[PDB]
């Protein structure tokens, strides 16, 4: 009953301990630089032109 | 014996703690300091749909990005044209509440859910030129709350008595369930390869889950309340939440702790949905104020405000080429955005 | 007869920002879901419509005769009598339509739908334009004293009996029936209401209940105010001889803007003060 | 008009789709909802039974009036989660037994439950419903075992009346809205049709109520 | 999914006669339904149309007021009521649904037959084309007027009568219909269009037409035979 | 005299 639980959550936490981590400031680098490469197809960052935009009228 | 597993639960949370703390090295607002602000973002509505006589609940737009299907109170749910504000077929439900609804990829197929604890298939393409029912899922114990196609024949939905499952649609059976979480599941996303995907609960935690194998990866805490809302990243690598208690927050799975949060001191209720852009910079969120705030993804700043409903904001969602966005209300009215 | 041609243009232009401010709200901020809405629309187009025939009239007094031909008299007799019927008629029904609604909740259900009240407008439309006949029939110019024309009403013969039967006809079908049907009806709601467990015992709910009552008899006392002179005056007029003075002429342009003034209080009893309008408003304002 | 045959046709569909939509919703609008709520063997599949998944609808007619009413007692989750759903229903059945005095005790449960229902958010002018049973096992036990032991400061005398008229009092003790709400209390008659009755003519208050509201006099 | 047709027989001049349809197996409600024509040696045309909900009507100018159409949806029935014939012919019923991404004309009747004792031009200059199995085949059909629209589509379509058979559709707004093999496509301009099958099989051996629903009357080619 | 609406 309750040994098995909580034999079950020792086993889940070591398993989730083996996780290898990388640091923070790559990851945010990253995540800015994926942002810079598609800046310019984002139709809402900056308004289409209006013969192309479809809810024009 | 329980001392004993307690104290070693303890040690390994210390642990984990201690590993997360040396991982931290450097702030996500340092990284993105020293760069020019997006400036103002104002929008304006460009259709109004009409046509429900209750309160809406959820809403999905198709692969195509120019059909939808949204669902309400009242028993039925509509798809409709966008370009032209044409209604292309209405469905009649045997179950008047539902919470959420799907279209599939192929866009052959709808879905739909609720208090009922049932999940129901919809042909959309006959010979016969109606639509009908086709398949209909029955193995939780709560009420779903969220569910989404992976293919023709593959769905995966969330329920409330905190357990998710894997469906195959021709034998009508589950295939895998997903057992973790302590409090009740509130929304799920899909990852882009279709190979993961993540949930929030009640708890106040979020876990990262794999398909094919089974079995929970990670753990995500810092919430005080309920999260209401999550969303993927479109490069797969983050995601974002949504919570009772007025604010947001930013995840990243490789280092696996929050980035950034996002809150202001007039603002007091509660979030209901929250959505990306096409390029992940834009962070849109509905609030229990009556309105619709635009979050920067990489600052925390306020981009925009959409106030045009005069209730609760239930739903909004983004097309796959990044053109328009919907959002529904408690008004029963859906508008379009550009 | 300066000052009073002063009191005619003030009256108009309030009537048609009244009227047509309403309209607009109902129009696109509301709808017409409710019978409510689709009575109130009617109401308000006829008081429009009845405003709209009052600056000729000011011409007339502020010259000594008419400056237009036969057919403009003519026309204008026949709309502004069609308009007056109208718009008595139609804060008839609705006053009637209160008391089905508020006083047999259940058996009224069952006869009440939009389609009932939208057949209901054109058939008072169509009464009022059955029962306008004899002033489209008999109308025109007349010469009067002071060496000029005025655009009045003649009759066959001239004769007296034409006259008195006119003023009863237009008597009994204008001031009795309807008040006498509104005042029934307000009593049987006021009697009907204060016997309502759910809706009396606080401090408060005698408050509220106060308003319906100040309400009602607000709705009563101003139809009465504003068109009785004019009946009485015209009664005493057709019975004896009167020399003509000037104070009589003005005391008799005087009684008819009266008439008109209660077109421009609908808008403020009906749609000004209801809970609802007022919600609607501010959603486009 | 610049448009085509193919899109006229659309056109048409379209407008025949919204022609139902609307006949759908008028004809929907009429109906009567209520909500049933209690706790565990507190007589509701009684009243149920009587009175002609997660969740079950009843649905019957009386005296030209269409009923419709939802119990969500095998939820078993939490519950201001989906609480808020059933805003905007006529009135709120809540029951009550009586004999689950003597087994803490579920009278106090019951009295929690009551209260926090009562005081709710979303109920600020809903009408709640208050029903008594189990009448008679609850006189048959009154002789045995006193009611004193769930309320010590209760000294009336060991009387049907008293002790009936001390517990209601004490359950209306518990509200805080006076002024927007009435609360009807019943008791239930096992061989009778008045439990029907009773909520029939409660209703037709409300009813008024709404009315008067929709005319514009309120 | 089935459509049957009768009536038909000889009938005097200046005469009238009543043709009937019943529909099976699909919602019929939620179809119109049209009226095609084919003589004894040449092409297809068109004679009526009757709109879902009975909201409208149109008719062929060379019968204009001399015939009737109507429909009975309760039970699922077609009527064509014709006055004062001159008319030798064969006579088809034709099931067409109109929405977004819909495929109207997909299903044709078999048909019956009736013996009696400003428009844009569709030609085809090409006839009785010698073919062999295995060789590609291609089939060009011209327009008076074009057949694109402000909104983005073109509406021509294609259709095959196997002999002794009914016209079958195969090609849409100029896109594959469902049951048909990938062997056939469609490429065309604004003016001028082609038809291309990619290996030639026996069971193509037929006549092919092309016709346009730009706007009302609706005009068919002429025929395209095929031998072996 | 006075009738209708108009003084003669």
Redesign the interface.
Same mark, same amino acid.
């Given at each position: 009953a309750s040994i098995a639980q909580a034999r079950k959550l020792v086993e889940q936490l070591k398993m989730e301990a083996n996780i290898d981590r990388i640091k923070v400031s790559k990851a945010a680098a990253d995540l800015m630089a994926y942002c810079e490469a598609h800046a310019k197809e984002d139709p809402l960052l900056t308004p289409v032109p209006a013969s192309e935009n479809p809810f024009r009228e | !014996?329980?001392d004993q597993?307690?104290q !070693?639960?303890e040690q390994?949370?210390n642990?984990?703690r201690d590993? #997360?703390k040396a991982?931290?090295?450097?702030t996500?607002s340092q990284?993105?300091n020293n760069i020019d602000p997006?400036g103002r973002?104002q929008?304006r509505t #460009? *259709?109004t749909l009409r046509?429900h006589?209750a309160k809406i609940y959820a809403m999905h737009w198709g692969t195509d990005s120019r059909?939808l299907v949204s669902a309400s109170?009242?028993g039925?749910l509509i798809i409709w044209?966008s370009?032209?504000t044409?209604?292309?077929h209405?469905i009649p439900l045997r179950?008047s509440?539902v919470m959420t609804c799907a279209y599939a990829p192929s866009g052959n197929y709808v879905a739909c859910g609720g208090?009922?604890?049932?999940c129901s298939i919809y042909n959309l393409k006959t010979? !016969?030129?109606?639509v009908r029912v086709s398949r209909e899922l029955a193995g939780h114990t709560?009420?779903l709350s969220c569910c989404r196609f992976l293919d023709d024949n593959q769905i995966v939905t969330s329920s409330?008595?905190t357990t998710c499952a894997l469906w195959d649609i021709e034998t009508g059976q589950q295939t895998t369930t997903f057992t973790?979480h302590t409090?009740?599941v509130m929304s799920l996303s899909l990852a882009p390869d279709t190979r993961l995907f993540v949930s929030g609960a009640?708890d106040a935690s979020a876990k990262l889950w794999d398909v094919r194998e089974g079995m929970? *990866?990670?753990?995500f805490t810092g919430h005080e309340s309920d999260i209401n809302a999550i969303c993927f990243?479109?490069?797969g690598?983050?995601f974002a939440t949504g919570s009772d208690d007025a604010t947001c927050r930013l995840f $990243?799975l #490789?280092?696996?702790?929050e980035?950034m949060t996002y809150s202001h001191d007039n603002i007091i209720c509660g979030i209901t949905s929250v959505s990306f852009?096409?390029?992940?910079?834009?962070l849109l969120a509905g609030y229990d104020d009556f309105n619709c705030n635009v979050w920067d993804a990489?600052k925390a700043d306020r981009a925009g405000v959409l106030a045009g409903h $005069?209730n609760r904001v239930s739903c909004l969602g983004v097309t796959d080429?990044?053109?328009?966005?919907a959002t529904g209300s408690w008004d029963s009215f859906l508008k379009?955005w550009? | 007869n300066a000052v009073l041609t002063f009191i005619y243009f003030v009256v108009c232009i309030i009537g048609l920002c009244g009227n047509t401010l309403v309209i607009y709200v109902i129009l696109r901020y509301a709808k017409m879901k409710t019978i409510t809405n689709i009575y109130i629309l009617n109401l308000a187009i006829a008081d429009e419509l009845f405003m709209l025939g009052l600056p000729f009239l000011a011409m007339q007094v502020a010259l000594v005769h008419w400056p237009f031909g036969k057919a403009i008299c003519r026309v204008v007799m026949t709309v502004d009598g069609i308009n007056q019927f109208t718009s008595i008629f139609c804060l008839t029904v609705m006053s009637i339509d209160r008391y089905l609604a508020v006083v047999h909740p259940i058996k009224s259900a069952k006869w009440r739908r939009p389609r009932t009240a939208k057949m209901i407008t054109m058939a008072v439309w169509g009464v009022s334009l059955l029962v306008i006949l004899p002033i489209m029939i008999y109308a025109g110019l007349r010469s009067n004293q002071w060496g000029r024309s005025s655009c009045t009403i003649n009759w066959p013969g001239e004769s007296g009996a034409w006259y008195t039967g006119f003023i009863i006809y237009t008597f009994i079908l204008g001031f009795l029936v309807p008040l006498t049907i509104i005042c029934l009806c307000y009593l049987f709601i006021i009697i009907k209401v204060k016997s309502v467990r759910l809706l009396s015992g606080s401090r408060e709910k005698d408050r509220n209940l106060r308003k319906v009552t100040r309400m009602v008899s607000i709705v009563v006392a101003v139809f009465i105010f504003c068109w009785l002179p004019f009946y009485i005056f015209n009664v005493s007029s057709v019975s004896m001889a009167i020399s003509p003075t000037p104070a009589l002429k003005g005391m008799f342009d005087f009684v008819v803007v009266l008439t008109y003034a209660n077109s421009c209080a609908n808008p403020i009893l009906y749609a000004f003060l209801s809970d609802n309008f007022k919600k609607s408003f501010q959603n486009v304002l | 008009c610049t448009l085509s045959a193919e899109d006229k046709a659309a056109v048409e569909r379209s407008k025949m789709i919204d022609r139902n939509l609307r006949e759908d919703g008028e004809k929907a609008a009429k109906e009567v909802k209520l909500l049933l709520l209690g706790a565990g063997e507190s007589g509701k599949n009684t009243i149920v039974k009587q009175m002609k998944t997660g969740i079950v609808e009843t649905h019957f007619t009386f005296k030209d009036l269409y009923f419709k009413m939802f119990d969500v007692g095998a939820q078993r989750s939490e519950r201001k989660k989906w609480i808020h759903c059933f805003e905007g229903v006529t009135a709120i059945i809540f029951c009550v037994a009586l004999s689950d005095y003597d087994l803490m005790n579920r009278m106090h449960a019951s009295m929690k439950l009551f209260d926090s229902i009562c005081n709710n958010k979303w109920f600020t002018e809903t009408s709640i419903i208050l029903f008594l049973n189990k009448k008679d096992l609850f006189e048959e036990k009154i002789k045995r075992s006193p009611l004193t032991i769930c309320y010590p400061e209760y000294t009336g005398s060991n009387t049907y009346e008293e002790a009936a008229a001390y517990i209601q009092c004490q359950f209306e003790d518990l509200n805080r809205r006076k002024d927007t709400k009435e609360i009807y209390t019943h008791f239930t008659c096992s061989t009778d049709t008045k439990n029907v009755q009773f909520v029939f003519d409660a209703v037709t208050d409300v009813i008024i109520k709404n009315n008067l509201k929709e005319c514009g006099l309120y | 999914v089935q459509l049957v047709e009768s009536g038909g027989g000889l009938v005097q001049p200046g005469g009238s006669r009543k043709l009937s349809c019943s529909a099976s197996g699909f919602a019929f409600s939620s179809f119109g339904m049209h009226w095609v024509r084919q003589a004894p040696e040449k092409g297809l045309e068109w004679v009526a149309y009757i709109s879902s909900g009975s909201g409208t009507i149109y008719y062929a100018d060379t019968v204009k007021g001399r015939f009737t159409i109507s429909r009975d949806d309760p039970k699922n029935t077609l009527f064509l009521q014709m006055t004062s014939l001159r008319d030798t012919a064969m006579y088809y019923c034709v099931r067409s649904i109109y929405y977004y991404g819909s495929s109207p004309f997909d299903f044709w009747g078999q048909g019956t037959t009736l013996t009696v004792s400003s428009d844009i031009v569709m030609t085809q200059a090409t006839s009785s084309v010698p073919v062999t199995p295995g060789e590609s085949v291609s089939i060009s059909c011209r327009s008076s007027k074009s057949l694109l629209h402000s909104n983005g589509n073109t509406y021509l379509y294609w259709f095959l009568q196997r002999p002794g058979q009914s016209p079958q559709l195969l090609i849409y707004r100029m896109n594959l219909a469902s049951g048909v093999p990938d062997r056939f496509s469609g490429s065309g301009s604004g003016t001028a269009f082609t038809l291309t099958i990619s290996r030639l099989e026996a069971e193509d051996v037929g006549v092919y037409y092309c016709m346009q629903h730009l706007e009302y009357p609706l005009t068919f080619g002429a025929g395209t035979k095929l031998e072996l | 005299x006075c009738f209708x609406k108009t003084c003669x």
């Open positions: - | !014996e329980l597993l307690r !070693e639960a390994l949370k642990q984990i590993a #997360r991982c931290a090295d450097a996500l990284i993105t997006v973002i929008m #460009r *259709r046509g006589l059909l109170q009242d039925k044209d370009y032209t044409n209604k292309v209405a179950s509440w208090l009922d604890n049932i010979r !016969e030129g109606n709560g009420y409330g008595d973790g409090g009740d009640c929970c *990866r990670q753990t990243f479109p490069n690598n983050a $990243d #490789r280092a696996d702790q980035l852009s096409k390029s992940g910079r834009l990489l $005069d080429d990044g053109m328009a966005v379009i550009n | - | - | - | -």
